[PDB]
């Protein structure tokens, strides 16, 4: 009974590292990523920050648990697993890779990787 695209990306973990000349982040230890109804979970994430663009940075997650879950009020859960995941800021691209699996009311697929957009 709340929005998911309505809410900011919440992130937490126990290691955090940045470099302004390396232009890159590290987080480490059970990284939890959430927005409203969406739950996404890894052990590490990577993001390159060029700067000069604004909002073209991408959030590449890896290491177990490497799981996705969502619950809609509209009787529509969806959940899945992989080894590696690409997540992003608005629509830009999405893919799950390494033993990827996904299930929903009108949708059932599994393999090395799943093709599905935002």
């Amino acid at each position: 009974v709340t929005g998911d695209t309505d809410q900011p990306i919440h992130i937490e973990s126990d290691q955090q590292s940045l470099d302004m000349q390396g232009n890159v982040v590290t987080f480490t230890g059970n990284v939890i990523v959430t927005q409203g109804t969406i739950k996404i979970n890894a052990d590490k994430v990577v993001v390159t920050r060029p700067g000069g663009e604004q909002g073209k940075e991408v959030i590449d997650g890896y290491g177990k648990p490497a799981t996705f879950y969502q619950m809609q009020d509209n009787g529509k859960p969806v959940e899945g697993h992989a080894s590696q995941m690409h997540y992003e800021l608005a629509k830009d691209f999405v893919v799950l890779t390494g033993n990827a699996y996904l299930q929903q009311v009108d949708s059932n697929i599994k393999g090395d990787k799943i093709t599905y957009l935002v």
């Binding site: 809410q7 919440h10 992130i11 937490e12 290691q15 955090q16 987080f27 927005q35 993001v47 608005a90």
Partner: peptide
């Protein structure tokens, strides 16, 4: 949607 995190190892948060 904005990127925001909380640091377990100090007590406080950031955007990046």
């Amino acid at each position: 949607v904005p990127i925001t995190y909380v640091n377990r190892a100090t007590x406080k948060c950031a955007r990046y």
